[PDB]
Nucleic acid binder design. Structure first.
Ligand SMILES: Nc1ncnc2c1ncn2[C@@H]1O[C@H](COP(=O)(O)O)[C@@H](O)[C@H]1O
Ligand SMILES: [K+]
Ligand code: NA
Ligand SMILES: [Zn+2]
Length: 180
DNA sequence: GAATCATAAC
């Protein structure tokens, strides 16, 4: 297939679709995640093309902080009266091209969350806190990721709220209900 | 049988 039409370039198309955009300014766009892994799941992307956190440098520090600020504003505007917790962050190893910040509610109540990989990508060190990434860029000048990230995706299912170990995704989804 | 493991997508 073509480069432009490859599955990995999908965000570059979605970020330009008015029906997916929930906020725009001079620097960033916010879209709904197409396969949300919780009740609220947005992606914040800069208009400027940066392939991944591997290409981030100190020139991008203000932009990374701006993406975070916008993420927090979207939470207020769209889910302010919600009693939900949110996290903002980046997958240690992304799949989709173009840097994008995850803004996701912590219920993890969604049909699109289907496997151990989905769970661990948001609930282990594989999920890099937005603030941590920002501070690493500020102090070290670039983002580095330690070895062993793919292995984290295979860890036994463990609830993010109470640390209980669950034997399956259906049982985990059931268990999560108690933290509503 | 239900659910997960890994592989494949030309
Ligand atoms: N065409 C698309 N539009 C919006 N979000 C997408 C699209 N394709 C995949 N996603 C989401 O983008 C994220 C990509 O994961 P990652 O590359 O690990 O950050 C996942 O949360 C997907 O559900
Ligand atoms: K198995
Ligand atoms: Na991947
Ligand atoms: Zn729990």
């Amino acid at each position: 297939g073509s480069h432009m039409g490859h599955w990995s370039q999908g965000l570059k198309i979605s970020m330009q679709d008015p029906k997916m955009q929930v906020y725009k300014d001079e620097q960033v766009v916010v879209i709904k995640d197409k396969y949300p892994k919780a009740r609220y799941h947005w992606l914040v992307l800069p208009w400027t093309s940066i392939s991944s956190l591997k290409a981030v440098a100190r020139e991008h520090l203000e932009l990374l902080k701006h993406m975070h600020t916008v993420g927090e504003k979207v939470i207020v505007d769209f889910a302010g009266s919600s009693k939900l917790r949110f996290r903002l962050g980046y997958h240690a190893i992304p799949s989709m091209s173009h840097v994008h910040l995850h803004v996701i509610s912590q219920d993890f109540d969604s049909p699109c969350l289907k496997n151990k990989k989905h769970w661990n990508s948001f609930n282990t060190e594989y999920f890099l806190e937005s603030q941590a990434v920002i501070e690493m860029v500020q102090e070290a000048g670039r983002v580095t990721v330690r070895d062993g990230m793919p292995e984290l995706l295979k860890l036994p299912l463990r609830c993010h709220e109470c640390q209980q170990l669950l034997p399956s995704i259906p049982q985990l989804k059931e268990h999560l209900r108690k933290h509503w």
